C-alpha cells in the first residue's frame with residue numbers, strides 16, 4: 001500500500017472551480033451526474049489528470065461535452081480514473097460524468113448510504129470519491145450547486161449545503177430540490193440528506209450584527225420528541241462562541257440531523273451537521289444521564305468546527321490536529337462553563353491518562369502531527385484529538401485568558417477564508433507571547449516539539465526547605481522514553497501550574513504561578529516561605545505528562561483534604577491508590593509464583609480511609625468528586641505502571657483493596673445512599689424537557705457508585721434497595737439496578753423487566769445491551785450468546801455491535817480468561833464486521849492495543865488471534881494496515 005508523507009505535500013496541477021451535481025435517487029440505484037468546471041494550475045507540468053473515484057460504475061465520462069474512450073483515452077481501476085494528458089485541455093474546461101452507486105447496500109457508512117429509511121452522506125475524510133469523481137483532498141476548494149431528486153412519499157425532506165433555491169415536481173411521483181452554496185469549501189464538507197424527517201426549530205439572534213439564524217433539528221418521526229435538548233445545546237454553543245471568542249455564526253440557517261447508523265459521534269458539514277442518533281436525541285424517560293453531557297459536547301464540538309475547521313481550513317490531512325485538537329479544546333472549555341461541575345475537567349483527564357497514554361506507549365504511538373500515513377480513515381485517534389486538545393489548552397495556561405483570546409483572535413483574523421498549518425497557529429500564539437512577556441525576542445519555537453514528538457513525558461520532583469532562610473526549592477526533571485519515532489527525545493516546553501499549601505491551616509502560600517520548564521531539569525526557588533509547604537503540582541492537570549510527585553501518603557492526604565485545586569486533590573488520591581495497588585499486586589504475584597501456602601498483604605493506609613470518610617461525610621463537598629474518590633483508578637491507567645501485567649493478579653489486588661475500604665466504610669456508604677435519595681431522584685423537573693441539572697446527575701452517579709460497592713460487598717439486605725431502585729423513573733437508576741443485581745438470584749428477573757422497559761426505544765435498547773454486556777456475571781459467555789441469538793442477530797448497526805461487545809471487553813476477569821476464549825470471541829466479531837464496515841471492525845480492535853503489556857501467556861494468546869485475523873484472505877486494507885502496525889510486523 002502507498003505511504004503518504006507529510007514532507008511530500010505539493011499543490012495539485014489542477015483547479016476545480018465549480019461543481020454542479022445531480023443526484024437522482026431510485027429504488028435500486030442512485031445515479032449521480034457531475035459537471036466540474038476545471039483549470040490547469042501554475043504548478044501543472046503536463047501530467048495525466050487523475051481523479052479519485054472508489055466503487056463507481058461509469059455510464060460515461062466527457063471533456064467539453066465529448067465522450068472519452070475507455071482504454072485509449074482513460075483507465076479506471078475502481079480507485080483512480082486516469083485521463084492521459086494528451087487528451088487533457090490546457091485552459092478552462094469541463095469534465096463531466098454519470099456514475100451509478102448503491103446507498104441501499106452501502107453498509108460501510110462512508111460515501112452515500114441508507115440508514116433505516118434516511119439517505120445520508122458521510123464524506124470526511126475520503127468518502128466524497130465514493131459518490132463521484134474528484135481530486136478528493138482538502139485543499140481543492142470549489143463552489144457547489146447541488147440538485148437532489150427522489151420519490152416524494154419516501155423522501156419528502158431534501159437537504160444539502162447552502163440555500164434551497166428551487167423545489168419542483170417530477171412525473172412518476174418524484175420531486176427535486178436545488179441547493180446553491182456559492183462560498184468555496186473542501187469536498188469533505190459536502191453533505192446531502194433525504195428522508196421523511198420531522199423537526200423542531202428556533203430562531204437565534206446573533207450578538208453583534210443582530211442577524212436572524214434559523215435552527216432546525218431533524219429526526220425520524222418516532223423520535224422527534226427527543227430533539228429538544230439538542231436545540232438548547234446549539235443555542236448554548238452559539239452564545240459561548242459569542243461570549244468567549246467574540247465569534248458569530250455567518251449563515252442564515254443551521255440544520256442538525258440524527259441518523260441511526262453512523263461510525264462516530266457526528267460531522268460538521270457546512271450548515272448541515274449530521275449526528276449519530278446517540279449523540280443528538282435524549283429524553284428524561286428514555287435516556288440515561290450520560291446522554292445529556294454527551295449531546296452538549298457533540299453539538300458543541302460540531303458548532304465550534306464552523307470556525308476551527310470550516311472557515312479556517314486545513315491545507316492537508318497531516319494538519320488534522322489543528323482542527324480536531326483545537327475544536328476538542330473549544331468543546332471542553334464550553335462543557336466546563338455549561339456544566340459548572342469540577343468532574344467535567346476530571347473526566348477529560350481520566351480519558352487522556354487511561355486511553356491516550358495507553359496508545360502513546362503502544363506500537364501505535366504517534367505525535368499529534370504524524371509524518372506519514374497509509375489509511376486516512378485510521379488517522380482520527382485519541383492522540384490527535386485528546387492530546388491535541390491538551391496541547392491547544394497549554395497555550396491558554398501559558399498565556400492566560402486575556403492574551404490567549406488575543407492570540408486566538410490573531411489566528412482567526414489572519415486565516416479566516418484560507419487554509420492553515422500548525423505553524424500558523426503557533427505563530428499567532430507567539431505574537432501574544434511576545435506581547436505578554438513584553439519582549440519581542442521571546443519565542444515559541446521549542447513549543448512546536450509538542451507537534452512532532454511522540455510519547456508521554458515523565459516529570460519528577462525533589463524538594464528542599466531551609467527553615468532558617470524561609471527558602472523553598474522545587475527541583476524538576478523531565479524525560480520522554482525513546483520509541484520508534486525519535487531515538488533522542490528533546491526537552492519540551494512544560495507549563496507547571498503550582499500552589500504551595502501550608503500543612504498547618506490548609507491556606508495558599510503564594511499567588512497563581514505557572515513554572516515554565518524548558519530544560520531537561522531546573523530548580524525553582526521561593527523566598528519568604530514561612531513554613532515547609534506541601535506543593536500542589538500541575539493544578540488543573542497543566543501538561544499531558546506522567547506526574548511523579550514523590551510525596552508521602554501523609555502529604556497526599558493533606559492535599560486531598562485541604563488543597564484548592566480539584567485535579568490535584570483527585571491526583572493525590574489516585575497516587576495513594578497506585579502505591580497501594582503496586583504493593584499488593586507484587587505480594588499477590590510473589591504468592592502465585594512461589595505457590596505460597598500462606599503470605600501477608602499490606603493493608604490500606606488507615607489515615608487514607610479516614611480522609612475518605614471525612615470527605616464523604618462533608619455535606620458541603622461535591623457529590624461528583626466523591627464518586628471519583630471511592631473508585632480505584634481505571635485498569636487501562638494502572639497498566640501503564642506494571643510490566644507483564646497478569647490481569648487475574650490485578651483483579652485480586654483490586655478486590656482486596658475495595659474489600660479493605662468497604663470493611664471500614666460500608667455503613668457510611670449505606671447511610672449516604674439513603675440520605676442522597678430525596679435530592680438525587682427529585683422529579684420536580686422530569687417533565688421539563690430543557691431543565692438539565694448536572695449537580696443532580698452527579699448525585700445519582702454517587703448513589704449508583706455506592707450501590708455497586710454495597711452490592712459487591714453483599715451488605716445486609718441490600719437486595720431490598722436494589723429492587724426498589726429498579727422501580728425508579730430514571731434509566732440511570734433502573735439500569736444500575738440490573739448490573740448490581742448480578743451478585744443476586746434476582747438478576748434474570750431484572751434482566752427481563754429492564755428489557756421490557758428498553759425494547760421499544762432503539763437508543764435505550766442499546767444502553768440496556770451495554771448494561772448486560774458489562775454485568776459482573778459468571779455466566780457472561782452464555783449471556784452474550786443469548787444477546788446474539790435474541791436481540792443483536794445480524795444487525796449491521798455499529799451502535800448495536802459496539803453495545804454488545806465493547807463493555808464486556810472491560811471485564812478484567814472474564815474477557816482475559818486464560819483459555820483465550822474472550823480474545824477468540826472478539827476476533828471473530830472483528831473479522832465478521834470487517835466484511836461490511838472496516839472502520840468499525842478497527843474500532844472493535846481496541847482491547848488488543850495493550851497486548852504487549854500483559855503477562856507472557858496472554859501476550860501470546862492475543863498475538864495468535866491478531867495473526868489469525870491478519871491471515872484472513874478477505875481482510876480490508878484498513879484493518880490490515882492497523883493490525884500490521886499494532887503487531888510490529
Ligand SMILES: N=C(N)Nc1ccc([C@H](N)P(=O)(O)O)cc1
Nearest residue numbers: 124125264265266267268377380
Ligand atoms: N473517523 C473517521 N474515519 N471519519 C470521520 C468522521 C467525522 C469526523 C468529524 N470531523 P468529528 O471530529 O468526528 O466531529 C471526522 C472523521
Ligand SMILES: [Mg+2]
Nearest residue numbers: 055056057101
Ligand atoms: Mg459501487
Ligand SMILES: [Mg+2]
Nearest residue numbers: 207239242243
Ligand atoms: Mg448571549
Ligand SMILES: [Mg+2]
Nearest residue numbers: 260762795797
Ligand atoms: Mg435498529
Ligand SMILES: [Zn+2]
Nearest residue numbers: 301305324327
Ligand atoms: Zn471534530
